[PDB]
Structures are given as C-alpha cells and as structure tokens.
Amino acid sequence: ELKIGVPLRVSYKEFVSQIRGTENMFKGFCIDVFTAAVNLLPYAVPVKFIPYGNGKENPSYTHMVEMITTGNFDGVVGDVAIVTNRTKIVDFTQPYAASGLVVVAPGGTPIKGIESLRERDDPIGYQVGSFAESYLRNELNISESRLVPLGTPEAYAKALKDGPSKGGVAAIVDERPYVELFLSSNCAYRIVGQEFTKSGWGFAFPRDSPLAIDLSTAILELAENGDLQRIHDKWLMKNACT
Ligand code: NA
Ligand code: NA
C-alpha cells in the first residue's frame, strides 16, 4: 500500500481537494487523471492518499515533494510543476497537463509582460506555496521585498484592484491553469504577454521508480483515447471572458 502525499489545497479545488469530513479521500482533475492512469497498469497499485498541509493555506509544493526523499511518502499526486529543483531529488512522470508562468494584470498598465515587470520595481503577486516564488527570486533576480503571496482568487482580485499604492500588486505571476480559472470569474484582468515557462504537472516518485516510467505510457494512452480531454472538460471547462 503506497502512502501518496496529496496537497491540501484551500483554493482552485477543481484540480484537487480533500472531500469534506474525510482524512484520506480526494477528488479533482489530478485525482481523476491519476486514477485513470493507474487503472491502465497491468499490476495492482494499492494507494492511501495522505493530506499534506495545515489546511489553512496551500502548502509548499517543493517541501511536499521533499517528503518522498525522507521516505514519509512513496509518491505525490497533485497539481505539481515538474521544475529542476524537484526533478533533481525525485522522478516525475511526463506531464499529464500543460502549465507555464504567465503575467496577469489590468488592461493598459505599464505591464505588457514579464520583461516590463523586471524593468520596474512594482510589487508582484504569486500563489502561496508555488515554485513561482523561487523562479522569480533566483532565475529572474526579482527582489524578495517585491513578492506578495496570495492564497485564493478573491485575494488575487483584491490585490489587483487595490494595486501597488494600497498594499496590492501591479500584476500576479502564476501557472496558466490557475490563471484561467481566476479570469473566468474576474474578467476585468487579462494575461499580458505569452507563457514564459512551460513546465507541466507530473506525478512524483522516488529516483529510479519504475512507476514514473510506466505511468508516462499510461498518460500516452489517456491522450490518444481522449480520456485526458474528457477529464479536463469534466473539471475545468469554464465561461471565458472573450
Ligand atoms: Na485542453
Ligand atoms: Na464537477
């Protein structure tokens, strides 16, 4: 029986959430893809889902994956970006979902994309517990003092409305999937510029886990037979702004 860490999300629960009144029961896009993939394997994979987080805010996804290395988890299943600092310590499947950082801002500001954001000294929103915090500091050398953690689409919307003057932000940097959910309920804001990273979401296992290999060929079967699209459309189909 594999102990599988699952992030205890407080927001964008379409991706994955703990079913209310349970410890070990989860639902969402990521759970459905995991389940569909495992069922395509020719051996049984018994699983216990173990919640990772205090349940008050989204957990550190990097610290979550780090629990595989200490042996606390046999695997992590969730909306987990396949980024270098994680791939060096655990083995991911190939991505089951496309992701990548975008800039979200109000229309017709000085923010035209990630480069404009770097040239300026405005405060930047990112999602609590995201790798995005680390990409901004280390890869793009953005100052720690500019970075504002936001937990939910309500907080996103408040931060963008208040703006830099009133303790909010000029823009938020976050993965496209959360930004698409955010905008479908908050059409006053837009993506400006393009995706400037392209790391997908994958299932995480210990270094040399054959599960990482096998599930990648399950993901190909899910892609071809159209179940990936079907499971996307079940959870994430939303009313667009344009
Ligand atoms: Na799609
Ligand atoms: Na549903």
UniProtKB/Swiss-Prot annotation:
Residues 110-242 are extracellular. Expressed predominantly in roots and siliques. GO terms for biological process: calcium ion transport; calcium-mediated signaling; cell-cell signaling; cellular response to amino acid stimulus; defense response to fungus; gravitropism; induced systemic resistance, jasmonic acid mediated signaling pathway; innate immune response. Keywords: Cell membrane, Disulfide bond, Glycoprotein, Ion channel, Ion transport, Ligand-gated ion channel, Membrane, Receptor, Signal, Transmembrane, Transmembrane helix, Transport. This is Glutamate receptor 3.3. The chain holds residues 465 to 813 of 933 of the full protein. It comes from Arabidopsis thaliana. Disulfide bonds join C187-C241. L-glutamate binds at R9, D79, V80, A81, R86, F131, E175, R176, P177, Y178. L-cysteine binds at D79, V80, A81, R86, F131, E175, R176, P177, Y178.
